[PDB]
């Protein structure tokens, strides 16, 4: 029973590989020979936000490019005003450990998750004038690794029990479930139209999910180790992944394979966060060796380096209008590069 | 209007600063312990459990890892800021001791856990006494081993059981002395199935860890 299914699976995998090799007419690094270089991008630190006590783990820019939410391990969740460097809200969390935080597109809700397996959604309206738990979701059995707001009432979550979930905040129930991975699922990224999304797990595969249907469409296995970072290209038809193998890879949703690989011989450190720029020409990758490399996303060359941090870069965020880039690391500082 | 907002946000900033200057004071004072142990082992003596207590007007938070997944390589990197990792193993089916050896090896060699100290408890010392009449099979090096001249045995203990104790200890010590001695240390202890001195032990080692950390700052150790 198992032999006729395993051999069939091997045949189907070989068919997919041969289809990919059949469609491989050329590479991105051949048709981009006559492209002007991006020069030396020398970015400057404009601000330095200093409020957190423990290491900063995750951050997320708001849709207005004004406010940002930062989550530390000390149990505090701080909302920063990027212009005036004023702390707007400080929220004490019930648990100490936080792994994810998300800022709603409308700015009404802030969600946070960690090892506690409970996703706390905070309402920022507060006509009383104090933050309060709107509703807490407890339907996971591992640890909550990443969450993102589709809109005010829907939130996608990623857990460490090999499954992803979609919640309804008003009811507090799971709308559906996503069961395709065979390892811990690290992070996910939503398309601008909120129609499709990708999920990167610790089995070196990336799954393309249909939000409305509840099934996966594509599986991309181009990596050698666990995929930590994943970020959609601004048009929603490509995405770049950052694994522990120290190489970045750029995948496509229509070519159904990798387009380009980013590697340097003097870099043997793991990748913790990636993010495209507004236009998509620059790709910012925060590495384990205490700096952020600015990769040319169409030439595979280093535009520059952001060596401002004194400890492991944990999170990297780019504004929706591309005006600034904020990076958070384990030295408890937020560096905003111009 | 433009002035009122730029005064209100200054006052909001100052109030949040005052709150963080009382919470920074609390956070730096309290020490943190990670209670990592096997399921077989007696770890009793949502996802995560928490114990909050105090000894000699010093606060201790101890964190019990509950219903997690067996893949530790991701979530353990959140624990590189605790003051000590307490590691409890039950002496004895498979070779659970070999799994404990491999886990301790992985903890020790880990890059992000080089600045964290490990407190070590050897549990089920009574079961070892019960095993003297029924071990040697899974270890070919127990025969070529002598009992320490510098470790005193408590009264009423079969010397073979003390030999097994010190052998197991030295199996953990060879791992701990294999690399990275300078940065962090390993503190092995003994414990019964029912014992009460354990908390005093942990206290008298946590002080030692903090003292050695300050002496590392002044480049003395």
């Amino acid at each position: 029973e198992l032999d006729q299914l395993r051999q069939e699976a091997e045949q189907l995998k070989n068919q997919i590989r041969d289809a990919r090799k059949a469609c491989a007419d050329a590479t991105l690094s051949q048709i981009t020979n006559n492209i002007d270089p991006v020069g030396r991008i020398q970015m400057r630190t404009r601000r330095t936000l200093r409020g957190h006590l423990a290491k900063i783990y995750a951050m997320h820019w708001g849709t207005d490019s004004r406010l940002l939410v930062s989550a530390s391990q000390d149990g505090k969740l701080i909302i920063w005003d990027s212009y005036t460097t004023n702390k707007v809200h400080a929220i004490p969390l019930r648990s100490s450990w936080v792994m994810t935080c998300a800022y709603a597109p409308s700015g009404n809700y802030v969600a946070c998750g960690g090892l506690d397996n409970i996703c706390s959604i905070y309402n920022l309206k507060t006509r009383e004038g104090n933050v309060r738990v709107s509703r807490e979701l407890a339907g996971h059995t591992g640890y909550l690794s990443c969450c993102r707001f589709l809109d005010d009432n829907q939130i996608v979550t990623s857990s460490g029990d090999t499954t992803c979930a979609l919640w309804d905040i008003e009811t507090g129930q799971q709308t559906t479930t996503f069961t395709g991975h065979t390892g811990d699922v690290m992070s996910l990224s939503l398309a601008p139209d909120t129609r499709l999304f990708v999920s990167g797990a610790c089995d070196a595969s990336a799954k393309l999910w249909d939000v409305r249907e509840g099934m996966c469409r594509q599986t991309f296995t181009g990596h050698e180790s666990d995929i930590n970072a994943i970020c959609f290209f601004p048009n929603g038809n490509a995405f770049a992944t950052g694994s522990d193998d120290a190489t970045c890879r750029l995948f496509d949703l229509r070519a159904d394979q990798e387009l380009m690989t980013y590697s340097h011989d003097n870099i043997i450190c793991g990748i913790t966060s990636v993010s495209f720029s507004k236009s998509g020409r620059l790709l910012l990758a925060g590495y384990d060796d205490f700096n952020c490399n600015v990769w040319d996303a169409l030439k595979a060359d280093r535009a520059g380096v952001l060596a401002g941090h004194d400890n492991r870069v944990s999170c990297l965020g780019v504004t929706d209008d591309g005006m600034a880039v904020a990076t958070g690391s384990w030295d408890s500082f937020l560096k905003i590069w111009n | 209007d433009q002035r009122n907002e730029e005064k209100a946000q200054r006052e909001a900033n100052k109030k949040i600063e005052k709150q963080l200057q009382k919470d920074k004071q609390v956070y730096r004072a309290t020490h943190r312990l990670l209670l990592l142990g096997a399921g077989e082992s007696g770890k009793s003596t949502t996802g995560i459990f928490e114990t909050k207590f105090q000894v000699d007007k010093v606060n201790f938070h101890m964190f019990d890892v509950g219903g997690q997944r067996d893949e530790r390589r991701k979530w353990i990197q959140c624990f590189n800021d605790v003051t000590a990792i307490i590691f409890v193993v039950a002496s004895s089916q498979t070779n659970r001791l070999q799994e404990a050896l491999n886990l301790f090896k992985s903890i020790w060699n880990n890059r992000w856990l080089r600045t964290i100290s490990v407190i070590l408890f050897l549990n089920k010392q009574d079961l070892l006494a019960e095993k003297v009449l029924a071990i040697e099979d899974y270890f070919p090096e127990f025969a070529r081993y002598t009992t320490p001249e510098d470790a005193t045995p408590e009264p009423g203990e079969d010397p073979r059981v003390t030999r097994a104790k010190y052998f197991i200890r030295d199996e953990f010590l060879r791992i701990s002395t294999a690399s990275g001695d300078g940065r962090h240390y390993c503190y092995p202890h003994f414990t019964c199935a029912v014992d009460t001195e354990n908390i005093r032990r942990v206290f008298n080692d946590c002080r030692d860890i903090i003292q050695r950390m300050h002496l590392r700052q002044y480049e003395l150790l």
């Epitope: 390892g183 610790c202 043997i268 | 997944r69 067996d70 090896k105 992985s106």
Partner: nanobody, 126 residues
């Protein structure tokens, strides 16, 4: 795509000798520390032996220490295990396992809950 293909095995008599191979395809074999894990019938996964990237540092489980010989071939990308002085108690399913991260010393590959970086396994019976 990281894929591992165990080779060799079969029914052998106690006191015999047998060799295994592990075809490592789809990754940079030279930069990964690897090891052998086994599953005894009705028991959990137990560590057998390992080998570092360069091949200098080698260690074995006590019960099989000095009886097995692990060797990696970075030229052809294959892991080679020699087993002499076989015992009736050494029957198990063998897994060629890879450590998840490059250029490191620590590994976490004893997870029975569908650990992705190990081969399908081979049967050894005595």
């Amino acid at each position: 795509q990281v894929q591992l293909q165990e080779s060799g095995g079969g029914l052998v008599q106690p006191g015999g000798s047998l060799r295994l191979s592990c075809a490592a395809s789809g990754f940079t074999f030279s930069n990964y520390k690897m090891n052998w894990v086994r599953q005894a019938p009705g028991k959990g996964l137990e560590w057998v032996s390992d080998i570092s990237q360069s091949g200098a540092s080698i260690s074995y489980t006590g019960s099989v220490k000095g009886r097995f010989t692990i060797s990696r071939d970075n030229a052809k990308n294959t892991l080679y295990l020699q087993m002499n002085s076989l015992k009736p108690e050494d029957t198990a399913v063998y897994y060629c396992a890879r450590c998840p991260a490059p250029f490191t010393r620590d590994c976490f590959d004893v997870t029975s809950t569908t650990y992705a970086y190990r081969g399908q396994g081979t049967q050894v019976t005595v």
